[PDB]
């Protein structure tokens, strides 16, 4: 081979972004969640401050002067008590005013939220396939 012979000095572990997998995908060498959800808001993706906090706190008291609220980037949506049921994340909400509201946190919803955080089946849904089938 004409390429220079070198010795591996570092090994940078990481993750594959969706773009890299598609781009990378074509002697031969061969050719080719719960913790975070409780820390960020499930509607805006901003850090609540975190598990104990169950509200986005759109307005927070000013540090310099008490009894003087300062507006912070938020949506004031009460956070769910996220629990891991099987392989899905089920969020339970505590209504202010009596069972808690329960719904399945779809991976699409979590993917959207994680993308808002501030380097390293097709046939069925295409036609018909009621929500139960999907």
């Amino acid at each position: 081979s004409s390429a220079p012979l070198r010795t591996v000095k570092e090994v940078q572990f990481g993750l594959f972004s969706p773009e890299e997998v598609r781009a990378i995908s074509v002697e031969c060498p061969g050719h080719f969640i719960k913790k975070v959800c409780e820390c960020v808001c499930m509607h805006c993706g901003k850090l609540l401050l975190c598990k104990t906090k169950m509200v986005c706190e759109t307005d927070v008291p000013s540090e310099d002067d008490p009894t003087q609220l300062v507006s912070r980037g938020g949506c004031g949506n009460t956070q769910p008590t996220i629990r891991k049921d099987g392989l899905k994340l089920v969020g339970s909400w505590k209504k202010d005013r009596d069972e808690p509201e329960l719904r399945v946190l779809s991976t699409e919803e979590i993917l959207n939220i994680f993308k808002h955080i501030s380097v390293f089946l097709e046939t069925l849904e295409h036609n018909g396939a009621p929500h139960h089938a999907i």
């Binding site: 509607h43 805006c44 759109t58 938020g74 949506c75 949506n77 993308k115 808002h116």
Partner: protein, 135 residues
């Protein structure tokens, strides 16, 4: 006694325009009392005057509706295929992408939607005082 008196294309158009809902009038009863209706119904479809739901076993007219829109056929298949090929981005990001291209987006990101004493002194008057809280 025909269910719907129709023996002319003009009569069919006015009857369909008078419907208060979108319940299409069946062709089974329309064909009754009308010697020919498919010939007129097909002619109107070519003129884009009405909408016809046709059977799949063989092309046969069924429940029809008034065409309140424009021409039924205006875009060539060469463009229909391209329209189907285009895949929309995620809704939360579509408005941002439209703004990047200089097109005013008629929507907003849902993430931006900001959807956010006991001791009584006198008791001998108990049961007498009405609560005139407001005026």
């Amino acid at each position: 006694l025909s269910t719907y008196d129709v023996h002319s294309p003009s009569e069919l158009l006015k009857l369909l325009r008078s419907q208060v809902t979108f319940k299409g009038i069946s062709c089974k009863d329309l064909k009754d009392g009308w010697p020919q209706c498919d010939e007129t119904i097909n002619q109107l479809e070519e003129d884009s005057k009405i909408l016809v739901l046709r059977t799949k076993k063989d092309k046969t007219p069924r429940y029809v509706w008034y065409n309140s829109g424009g021409n039924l056929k205006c875009i060539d298949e060469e463009f229909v295929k391209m329209w189907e090929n285009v895949q929309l981005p995620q809704f939360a990001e579509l408005p941002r992408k439209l703004q990047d291209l200089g097109l005013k987006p008629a929507s907003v990101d849902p993430a931006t939607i900001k959807r956010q004493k006991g001791k009584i002194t006198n008791t001998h008057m108990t049961g007498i005082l009405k609560d005139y809280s407001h005026r």
